[PDB]
Amino acid sequence: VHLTPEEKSAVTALWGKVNVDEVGGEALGRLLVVYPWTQRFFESFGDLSTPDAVMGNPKVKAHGKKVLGAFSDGLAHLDNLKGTFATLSELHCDKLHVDPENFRLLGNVLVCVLAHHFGKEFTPPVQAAYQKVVAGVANALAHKYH
Amino acid sequence: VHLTPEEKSAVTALWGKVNVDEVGGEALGRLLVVYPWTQRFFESFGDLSTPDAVMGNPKVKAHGKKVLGAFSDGLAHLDNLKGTFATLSELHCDKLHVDPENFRLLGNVLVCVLAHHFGKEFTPPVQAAYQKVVAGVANALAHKYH
Amino acid sequence: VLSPADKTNVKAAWGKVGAHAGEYGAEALERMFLSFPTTKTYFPHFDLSHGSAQVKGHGKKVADALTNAVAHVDDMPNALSALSDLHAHKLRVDPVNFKLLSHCLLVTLAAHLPAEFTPAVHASLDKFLASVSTVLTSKYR
Amino acid sequence: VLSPADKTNVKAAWGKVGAHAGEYGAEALERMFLSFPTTKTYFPHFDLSHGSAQVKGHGKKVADALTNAVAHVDDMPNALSALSDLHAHKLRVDPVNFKLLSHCLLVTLAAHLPAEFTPAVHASLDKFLASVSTVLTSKYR
Ligand code: HEM
Ligand code: HEM
Ligand code: HEM
Ligand code: HEM
């Protein structure tokens, strides 16, 4: 994850704007709605049976917020994504046994969510930069499998 | 790529037996036959139109042999798969732009080929060890994309 | 496989896209090429810069096929079978690249229709884009 | 989509597998579980050790469904549709795991039939295993 001054300019300018209150619950909800086998990991959480149930679940919007944290984290330490994510990688790999592919899918729904939210400002060059980052994180989370 | 003494015992015992003359051309041929979009990278090579053409191509059996080299290489340096594969990763990533997924697929056809060749000796514990390695290499080749 | 709901949703979202589907396709291609540089290798002849005329041109054609699929969603194999031979048979298109483009298509649609890009509809559009992709690679599989 | 050649090949390879398909299934499951530990999470109730009786038991059932598919290869959606609801609808099976098991099935078949595991047949078996997998996850897609 190397990022040019301009990519970094495109990522951090955008991310400051981001409603860290809601977007994190949008991403997670949409992940559980669009790719339903992931609900297997949140059967607790609760009423997940219809798209409306999922999006109005206190517990979905609360956790998604935790998840965006780890994401603002990585933005900080792009030079060192692995050390940053090492305890989470242990968690998702060894304790949960989440297939790494779903790290990708979350990355991509998060990018849809930033597209939905920012519209025209989420230009192709700004999407390209975010996919690099998203791939960076997914790769970091996955490390404990390697 | 960490490997236990027993996994390592299972990988190196097997690999000594391996007909490095032929297996490398079996893997590559089968990759081009089973997943035909990969032929796009070897349209030179020649008559690739039928499974028989592909398997009797001097150029397929010659290159596959190069490829098994890199593989015996990695077996040497499991502690350091990235440094070992760094110039090849540049090659396959930046020059060729091969999708990393096909690094996986090759890894897996190579494991089929070792199954075909060794039969009963390629027990589940020995396959498990080889998938670790195969994933190690694929991950190494892919690094220049990260 | 697509439910009766997903059909309604795809037609709803499509109609809304309207006479802009050409432009949307060009944009989704542009996103792909920038975000996933590996896809570029298949287009050695195009000029892939921003305002490229071959990218606009190709974006309409992509858009026109997806509209045929939608209008024929209950018979996509017949509708699209010619294009499957093209993609899965002549150009030898790595199937991973159908994922990347479906992704960029969704991003483009989310960038354009904030009212209609709801979760249920994002789910339907994913499914419909996965459907089309299963048919375009079927000669493979 | 499967050609007339692939059908012949699958039936050829299958017949050869014979009354050992039960055992082959148990072995392909055992390979999966060892090689891909992440798949284990779906079987919290089984004892996954080597000679497990629930693994043999389950290996026959996997083998029996694949035999139904083969005998009904021109109508796999109907044949398998019940099992699609099971897998794609109740147990919520991550679709990536269909790949891993198809892979282990091929390895098991290569380990057992060195005469009939030729390239053309490996190609057909891949396709047939990709076919079955598209139907088992279709509720998803
Ligand atoms: C793309 C990367 C993702 C990130 C950044 C990430 C981040 C996190 C964070 C912040 C936590 C909280 C850990 C803590 O409380 O200290 C967590 C927990 C969790 N994640 Fe993820 N995660 C990711 C993807 C996923 C996926 C794809 C799944 C599964 C479908 C998943 C399943 C879980 C579950 C079940 C927990 C709860 C663990 C517990 O409470 O014991 N995560 N993740
Ligand atoms: C799983 C890992 C793989 C390994 C170990 C590997 C190894 C190698 C090696 C040893 C070479 C020769 C480099 C040299 O001459 O110094 C090479 C070249 C090549 N590989 Fe791979 N490779 C891998 C996968 C693939 C895949 C999946 C494709 C594409 C479908 C591919 C396409 C090429 C091509 C076209 C060349 C020729 C480059 C040239 O001559 O200019 N390789 N690879
Ligand atoms: C959503 C699925 C896709 C649809 C709807 C689609 C549709 C089309 C159509 C409508 C054409 C023109 C057909 C003709 O005039 O004969 C075309 C050509 C082609 N497509 Fe696609 N395509 C898709 C995905 C892809 C992807 C994933 C790639 C690979 C990165 C690809 C590479 C090409 C190539 C190389 C050609 C010929 C372009 C040229 O050389 O002028 N397509 N596509
Ligand atoms: C080649 C595709 C597969 C076929 C042929 C298949 C077929 C079957 C069959 C025949 C049953 C028993 C059905 C019944 O008695 O109602 C079963 C159950 C099940 N399968 Fe599969 N399956 C496949 C792949 C998978 C994979 C990839 C996983 C996930 C790792 C999976 C997880 C399970 C689970 C959890 C159940 C219930 C087991 C239990 O709790 O007792 N299956 N499968």
JSON list of N, CA and C in Angstrom, two decimals, chain D residues 99-120:
[
{"chain": "D", "resi": 99, "resn": "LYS", "atom": "N", "xyz": [-15.94, -24.19, -4.26]},
{"chain": "D", "resi": 99, "resn": "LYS", "atom": "CA", "xyz": [-14.66, -24.27, -4.95]},
{"chain": "D", "resi": 99, "resn": "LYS", "atom": "C", "xyz": [-13.68, -25.23, -4.27]},
{"chain": "D", "resi": 100, "resn": "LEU", "atom": "N", "xyz": [-13.49, -25.04, -2.96]},
{"chain": "D", "resi": 100, "resn": "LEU", "atom": "CA", "xyz": [-12.55, -25.81, -2.20]},
{"chain": "D", "resi": 100, "resn": "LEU", "atom": "C", "xyz": [-12.92, -27.26, -2.22]},
{"chain": "D", "resi": 101, "resn": "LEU", "atom": "N", "xyz": [-14.20, -27.57, -2.18]},
{"chain": "D", "resi": 101, "resn": "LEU", "atom": "CA", "xyz": [-14.55, -28.94, -2.10]},
{"chain": "D", "resi": 101, "resn": "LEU", "atom": "C", "xyz": [-14.43, -29.57, -3.52]},
{"chain": "D", "resi": 102, "resn": "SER", "atom": "N", "xyz": [-14.78, -28.82, -4.55]},
{"chain": "D", "resi": 102, "resn": "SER", "atom": "CA", "xyz": [-14.66, -29.33, -5.94]},
{"chain": "D", "resi": 102, "resn": "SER", "atom": "C", "xyz": [-13.21, -29.64, -6.16]},
{"chain": "D", "resi": 103, "resn": "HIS", "atom": "N", "xyz": [-12.35, -28.82, -5.59]},
{"chain": "D", "resi": 103, "resn": "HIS", "atom": "CA", "xyz": [-10.91, -29.02, -5.77]},
{"chain": "D", "resi": 103, "resn": "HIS", "atom": "C", "xyz": [-10.54, -30.34, -5.10]},
{"chain": "D", "resi": 104, "resn": "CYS", "atom": "N", "xyz": [-10.93, -30.51, -3.84]},
{"chain": "D", "resi": 104, "resn": "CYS", "atom": "CA", "xyz": [-10.58, -31.73, -3.14]},
{"chain": "D", "resi": 104, "resn": "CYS", "atom": "C", "xyz": [-11.17, -32.99, -3.76]},
{"chain": "D", "resi": 105, "resn": "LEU", "atom": "N", "xyz": [-12.39, -32.88, -4.31]},
{"chain": "D", "resi": 105, "resn": "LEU", "atom": "CA", "xyz": [-13.00, -33.97, -5.09]},
{"chain": "D", "resi": 105, "resn": "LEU", "atom": "C", "xyz": [-12.10, -34.41, -6.29]},
{"chain": "D", "resi": 106, "resn": "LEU", "atom": "N", "xyz": [-11.62, -33.44, -7.06]},
{"chain": "D", "resi": 106, "resn": "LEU", "atom": "CA", "xyz": [-10.67, -33.71, -8.14]},
{"chain": "D", "resi": 106, "resn": "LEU", "atom": "C", "xyz": [-9.41, -34.34, -7.66]},
{"chain": "D", "resi": 107, "resn": "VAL", "atom": "N", "xyz": [-8.82, -33.82, -6.59]},
{"chain": "D", "resi": 107, "resn": "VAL", "atom": "CA", "xyz": [-7.60, -34.43, -6.04]},
{"chain": "D", "resi": 107, "resn": "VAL", "atom": "C", "xyz": [-7.91, -35.88, -5.68]},
{"chain": "D", "resi": 108, "resn": "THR", "atom": "N", "xyz": [-9.09, -36.15, -5.13]},
{"chain": "D", "resi": 108, "resn": "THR", "atom": "CA", "xyz": [-9.37, -37.48, -4.61]},
{"chain": "D", "resi": 108, "resn": "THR", "atom": "C", "xyz": [-9.47, -38.43, -5.80]},
{"chain": "D", "resi": 109, "resn": "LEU", "atom": "N", "xyz": [-10.04, -37.94, -6.91]},
{"chain": "D", "resi": 109, "resn": "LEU", "atom": "CA", "xyz": [-10.29, -38.68, -8.15]},
{"chain": "D", "resi": 109, "resn": "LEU", "atom": "C", "xyz": [-9.00, -38.92, -8.92]},
{"chain": "D", "resi": 110, "resn": "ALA", "atom": "N", "xyz": [-8.13, -37.94, -8.92]},
{"chain": "D", "resi": 110, "resn": "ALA", "atom": "CA", "xyz": [-6.76, -38.09, -9.42]},
{"chain": "D", "resi": 110, "resn": "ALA", "atom": "C", "xyz": [-5.94, -39.09, -8.60]},
{"chain": "D", "resi": 111, "resn": "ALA", "atom": "N", "xyz": [-6.20, -39.16, -7.29]},
{"chain": "D", "resi": 111, "resn": "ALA", "atom": "CA", "xyz": [-5.46, -40.08, -6.40]},
{"chain": "D", "resi": 111, "resn": "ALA", "atom": "C", "xyz": [-5.86, -41.54, -6.63]},
{"chain": "D", "resi": 112, "resn": "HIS", "atom": "N", "xyz": [-6.96, -41.77, -7.34]},
{"chain": "D", "resi": 112, "resn": "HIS", "atom": "CA", "xyz": [-7.65, -43.08, -7.36]},
{"chain": "D", "resi": 112, "resn": "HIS", "atom": "C", "xyz": [-7.71, -43.71, -8.74]},
{"chain": "D", "resi": 113, "resn": "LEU", "atom": "N", "xyz": [-7.71, -42.86, -9.78]},
{"chain": "D", "resi": 113, "resn": "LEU", "atom": "CA", "xyz": [-7.91, -43.29, -11.16]},
{"chain": "D", "resi": 113, "resn": "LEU", "atom": "C", "xyz": [-6.82, -42.66, -12.00]},
{"chain": "D", "resi": 114, "resn": "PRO", "atom": "N", "xyz": [-5.57, -43.16, -11.92]},
{"chain": "D", "resi": 114, "resn": "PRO", "atom": "CA", "xyz": [-4.50, -42.61, -12.79]},
{"chain": "D", "resi": 114, "resn": "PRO", "atom": "C", "xyz": [-4.71, -42.90, -14.30]},
{"chain": "D", "resi": 115, "resn": "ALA", "atom": "N", "xyz": [-5.41, -43.97, -14.65]},
{"chain": "D", "resi": 115, "resn": "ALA", "atom": "CA", "xyz": [-5.71, -44.17, -16.04]},
{"chain": "D", "resi": 115, "resn": "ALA", "atom": "C", "xyz": [-6.73, -43.18, -16.56]},
{"chain": "D", "resi": 116, "resn": "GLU", "atom": "N", "xyz": [-7.81, -42.91, -15.84]},
{"chain": "D", "resi": 116, "resn": "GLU", "atom": "CA", "xyz": [-8.84, -42.08, -16.47]},
{"chain": "D", "resi": 116, "resn": "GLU", "atom": "C", "xyz": [-8.78, -40.59, -16.16]},
{"chain": "D", "resi": 117, "resn": "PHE", "atom": "N", "xyz": [-7.81, -40.15, -15.35]},
{"chain": "D", "resi": 117, "resn": "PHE", "atom": "CA", "xyz": [-7.76, -38.75, -15.04]},
{"chain": "D", "resi": 117, "resn": "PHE", "atom": "C", "xyz": [-6.91, -38.03, -16.04]},
{"chain": "D", "resi": 118, "resn": "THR", "atom": "N", "xyz": [-7.35, -38.02, -17.30]},
{"chain": "D", "resi": 118, "resn": "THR", "atom": "CA", "xyz": [-6.60, -37.33, -18.35]},
{"chain": "D", "resi": 118, "resn": "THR", "atom": "C", "xyz": [-6.94, -35.85, -18.35]},
{"chain": "D", "resi": 119, "resn": "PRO", "atom": "N", "xyz": [-6.21, -35.07, -19.09]},
{"chain": "D", "resi": 119, "resn": "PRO", "atom": "CA", "xyz": [-6.53, -33.66, -19.18]},
{"chain": "D", "resi": 119, "resn": "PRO", "atom": "C", "xyz": [-7.97, -33.33, -19.60]},
{"chain": "D", "resi": 120, "resn": "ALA", "atom": "N", "xyz": [-8.46, -34.00, -20.64]},
{"chain": "D", "resi": 120, "resn": "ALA", "atom": "CA", "xyz": [-9.75, -33.65, -21.20]},
{"chain": "D", "resi": 120, "resn": "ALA", "atom": "C", "xyz": [-10.83, -33.95, -20.15]}
]
